[PDB]
Amino acid sequence: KRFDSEKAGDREVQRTMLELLNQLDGFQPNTQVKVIAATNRVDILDPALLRSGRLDRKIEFPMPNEEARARIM
Amino acid sequence: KLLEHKEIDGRLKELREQLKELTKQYEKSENDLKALQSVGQIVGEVLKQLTEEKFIVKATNGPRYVVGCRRQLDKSKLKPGTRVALDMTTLTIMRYLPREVDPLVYNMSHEDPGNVSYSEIGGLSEQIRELREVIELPLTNPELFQRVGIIPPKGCLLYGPPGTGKTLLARAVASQLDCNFLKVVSSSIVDKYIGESARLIREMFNYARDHQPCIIFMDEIDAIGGRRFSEGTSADREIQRTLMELLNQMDGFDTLHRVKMIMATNRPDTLDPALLRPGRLDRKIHIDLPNEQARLDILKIHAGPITKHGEIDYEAIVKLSDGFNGADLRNVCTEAGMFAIRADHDFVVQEDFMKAVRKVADSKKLESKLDYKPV
Amino acid sequence: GDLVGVNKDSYLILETLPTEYDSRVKAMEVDERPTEQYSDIGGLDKQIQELVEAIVLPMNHKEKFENLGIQPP
Numbered sequence A: 001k002r003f004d005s006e007k008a009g010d011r012e013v014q015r016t017m018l019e020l021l022n023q024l025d026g027f028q029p030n031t032q033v034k035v036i037a038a039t040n041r042v043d044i045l046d047p048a049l050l051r052s053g054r055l056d057r058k059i060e061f062p063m064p065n066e067e068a069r070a071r072i073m
Numbered sequence B: 001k002l003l004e005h006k007e008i009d010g011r012l013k014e015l016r017e018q019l020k021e022l023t024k025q026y027e028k029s030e031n032d033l034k035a036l037q038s039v040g041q042i043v044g045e046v047l048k049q050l051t052e053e054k055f056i057v058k059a060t061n062g063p064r065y066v067v068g069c070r071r072q073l074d075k076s077k078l079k080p081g082t083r084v085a086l087d088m089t090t091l092t093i094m095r096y097l098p099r100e101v102d103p104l105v106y107n108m109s110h111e112d113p114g115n116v117s118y119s120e121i122g123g124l125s126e127q128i129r130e131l132r133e134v135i136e137l138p139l140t141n142p143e144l145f146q147r148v149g150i151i152p153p154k155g156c157l158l159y160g161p162p163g164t165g166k167t168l169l170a171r172a173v174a175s176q177l178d179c180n181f182l183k184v185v186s187s188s189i190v191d192k193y194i195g196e197s198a199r200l201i202r203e204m205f206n207y208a209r210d211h212q213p214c215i216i217f218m219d220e221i222d223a224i225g226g227r228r229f230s231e232g233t234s235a236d237r238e239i240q241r242t243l244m245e246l247l248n249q250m251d252g253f254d255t256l257h258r259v260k261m262i263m264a265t266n267r268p269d270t271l272d273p274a275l276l277r278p279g280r281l282d283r284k285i286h287i288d289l290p291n292e293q294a295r296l297d298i299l300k301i302h303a304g305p306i307t308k309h310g311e312i313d314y315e316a317i318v319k320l321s322d323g324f325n326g327a328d329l330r331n332v333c334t335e336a337g338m339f340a341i342r343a344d345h346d347f348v349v350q351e352d353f354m355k356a357v358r359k360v361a362d363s364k365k366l367e368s369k370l371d372y373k374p375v
Numbered sequence C: 001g002d003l004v005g006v007n008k009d010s011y012l013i014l015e016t017l018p019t020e021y022d023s024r025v026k027a028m029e030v031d032e033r034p035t036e037q038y039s040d041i042g043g044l045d046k047q048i049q050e051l052v053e054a055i056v057l058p059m060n061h062k063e064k065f066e067n068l069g070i071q072p073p
């Protein structure tokens, strides 16, 4: 996530993230490449990355139940 | 009868046909050999002239030379600051050249295959008028403001929640106006060299100054327009240097004429207090979330082209979709089409819309709902 | 902005070269395809179906999309 500060900050990674945001959707539409992303902690992620036009479908992986565990073993 | 020469005549005709290609080949060889007997010339900039036959010129790199000039060349065009070409073995003035145009600025000058018009954007018919009041009317009918006794503003910025239709509006304005236009992203003009970052922006303002009617648009201004740190780290004060260079270029010691700027960002908290001052960014434009009528308009815009069937009721869709965006409604249309894809159908029913609305609705639980306002 | 080969002394264009890419970017393209199949994953049928209909399908069955007037995710 981005933030506001005046004593010190962390801006370079934010600029690379802004360029990545601009690559998806943005001024120039792209329709030949597909993007897959993986993570395991969503609450610390920037809301602009979770826009519907930038990341369309969201899949959640639940913990396996009894039958799934038996199948895995 | 008289065909005693006919065979020899045909042989001569074939030989002439071959000689045509042999002469094309001879010409090609002549051009190839003629081209390879020339050398290049170094490029520099003149500073002043000491006497009738002596000038002092500076190359693109450091060293400065005291050089002569060609006899036939005119000496009335060599004012200080012009660009000249010098011989590589004697360093004599040979020719003067026009001003440079950077390849980056050339690429930035024209890149827009899109053809979006005003019919594809809906729900914000007032902010579009507010924006067009700045860049369209003063550039064509400028005696009205002089008659009243004011000066029209220069720039403006647009802000709001993500995905409310800012870049789309900018694309529509750029694609539906006959004037010189520049399009750039603020995060693509930075590089590790010492002076390039502040040089590129000076170059683009010079290019805009040359062709007097231009519009400059810079997306994601928060990349370089953030607040200036105290006790900050190295390799970060260069961005600040570029920032104050930009602040001086616009509303500085020299006035701009017939130049307008447009900026966009979806969180204006972090912007420098000096950049938001009136006189630099005169107008602040807000693009909020759509209303019920705006939602119905966007739905009618985007749900049109699909091969629908049966009866459709937009009222329930409008009531259910709360706090959505244009991207959310496009996603609703896409998800309805996907549910149509399953069960092997080739038409859409309102039940698909009802399912897709609630499918999209719960995905917004994990997305923050904060809203930011400039201050 | 084109990339050209120039004579070392006379300084004339001799040929045109293909556009160059960073070594790090080139090194991240896959060469040896993995050998894992769908059969060895248990208890993720819904996730697999939802993922395959948004990535693989819009490539081999595009004719099913424009016939309806819907853009892929």
Ligand SMILES: Nc1ncnc2c1ncn2[C@@H]1O[C@H](COP(=O)(O)OP(=O)(O)OP(=O)(O)O)[C@@H](O)[C@H]1O
Residues within 6 Å of the ligand: A025, A026, A048, A051, A053, B120, B121, B122, B123, B124, B161, B162, B163, B164, B165, B166, B167, B168, B169, B266, B298, B301, B325, B326, B327, B330
């Ligand atoms: N009023 C509108 N009418 C139609 N479509 C809209 C409207 N507002 C937004 N959209 C949709 O938004 C999509 C992309 O939005 P856009 O690129 O303008 O985002 P934004 O508001 O600039 O957000 P950000 O740049 O912060 O990601 C377009 O493809 C379009 O379908």
Ligand SMILES: [Mg+2]
Residues within 6 Å of the ligand: A026, B166, B167
């Ligand atoms: Mg945008």
